[PDB]
From a paper:
NbUGT72AY1 is a promiscuous transferase that glycosylates bioactive hydroxycoumarins such as scopoletin and umbelliferone, as well as monolignols involved in lignin formation and various other small molecules. Five distinct GT protein folds have been identified that are capable of GT activity (termed GT-A to GT-E). NbUGT72AY1 adopts a GT-B fold comprised of two distinct N-terminal and C-terminal Rossmann-like domains (shown in cyan and brown in Fig. 2, respectively) of seven and six parallel β-sheets, respectively linked to α-helices, connected by a linker region and an interdomain cleft.
Moreover, NbUGT72AY1 crystallized in the presence of scopoletin (III), UDP (IV), and a mixture of scopoletin and the non-transferable donor UDP2FG (V). In all structures that have scopoletin bound (III, V, VI, VIII, and IX), H2 has 2-3 turns while conformers associated with UDP (IV) and UDP2FG (VII) have 4 turns. The arrangement of the Trp350 side chain in the 3D structure obtained in the presence of scopoletin (III) is clearly different. Binding of scopoletin (III) or UDP2FG (VII) results in the conversion of the loop (loop 2) between Ile42-Leu59 (green) into a helix (helix 2), but differ in the orientation of Try350 (blue) (Trp-, π interaction with uracil is not possible; Trp + , π interaction), whereas the closing loop remains flexible in both structures (yellow/red). The complexes with UDP2FG (VII_E and VII_B) show significantly more interactions within the protein than the structures with scopoletin (III), which is due to the increased number of van der Waals interactions. Starting with the apo-enzyme (I), two different conformational changes can occur after substrate binding depending on whether the acceptor (I → III) or donor (I → VII) is the first to interact with the protein.
Author numbering: 3 to 310, 327 to 477
Write the structure that this text describes.
Amino acid sequence: SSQLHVAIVSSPGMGHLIPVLVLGNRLATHHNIKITILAITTTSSSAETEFLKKTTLTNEEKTIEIIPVPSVDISHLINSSTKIFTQLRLLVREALPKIHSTIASMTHRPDALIVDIFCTQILPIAEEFNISKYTYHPTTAWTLALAIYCQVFDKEIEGEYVELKEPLKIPGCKALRPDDVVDPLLDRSDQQYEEYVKLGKEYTDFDGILINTWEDLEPETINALRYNEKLRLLLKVPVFPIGPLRRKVETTLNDEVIQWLDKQNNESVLFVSFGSGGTLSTKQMTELAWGLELSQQKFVWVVRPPSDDMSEYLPEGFLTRTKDMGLVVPMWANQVEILSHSSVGGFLTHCGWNSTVESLTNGVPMIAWPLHAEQKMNAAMLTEELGVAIRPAVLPTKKLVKREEIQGMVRILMQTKEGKRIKEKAKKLKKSAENALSDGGSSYNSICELVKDIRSREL
Ligand SMILES: COc1cc2ccc(=O)oc2cc1O
């Protein structure tokens, strides 16, 4: 059968574009699919727009093309209380005219549209043009089951979710501690709550849902999404675990971090990074600085100014005391390259799924320090279910983590026999992930099943 054309729509931000590009890459190379990426961007001045200028919009063999789609300016449509979830929904809504015309001009219409979590409002455009439409859930199956079931919790639960004193029971799935609810569930009176319940229903309107997870990681929740009688009252279409999708390493030979790592022993270094979406209070940054020093472990720490020469933000004499023990890297690092280095033995992260996937596919265990979005659910999975992470006694967003506990966690993970058990479990998940993505593996098979659904709908 002849070539399929699939357009994938990314919402604004590198955090959304990159996984879309990774999916596009996998579909064009291993699945004979011609890919168009519709990369919705902000009006101006984005890390994303800079990326798109430095990179080429098309590849050698004309199998992938990136079409930047700039949104309009939304600053007049928001205020200081407007949450990120709401802002993303609004940026895509405002780009719908330009998404519509972009698709209209495509003489060879796409055989299918795959849209981001934050692009489900494109659904009526797919309808209008008679294009098969699928959505891509860029994080765990557990969080997908929450979004879809939330419309039930909304009618069955009277007050704030955060005030419940019993787990929320997702049929057939892990029960959810009220402390761990995703961000939009923290305040039902906020606009983003209703937007989130709406999203959970919009999933149901698609022809299928791709998930950035794999069968062996979440067998219970995937099986529930497929067959559980209560969830299937709500979800009528298949799910496709096609992950874990992760960006490729792009080397920089003269990278001083990599040079410093090259001189360390195997699996001896704690990488500490809260990414771009992460900041700590002044008080928390001080405790983290002291915990790292007190641990006497090797570390690489990506530092950013705190929020209530990086020397101003560290304890007096920090860089002198920790010379030879630790590297303080300012603002940014090649994270995927660092996590693949043989000297890295642990990762203190916020548990964003992209970061988690980059860690697990390198077999690196974690200290789970969730901050926002769906990270508390990710952290709960990594520590309670998967056994590849340790964590503070109390959520960092509830209580200050003190230097003593941080010292103790770094030690447990990097020195004790317990930490070695956690590292071995992470090495097993690395293999599970590799198997899933291999030819004939579960995520490979799920892509073939997706392609069959697309073809079937054109008969
Ligand atoms: C803080 O706003 C966010 C909330 C959620 C919730 C579930 C999810 O799967 O992703 C999210 C991404 C976000 O930026």
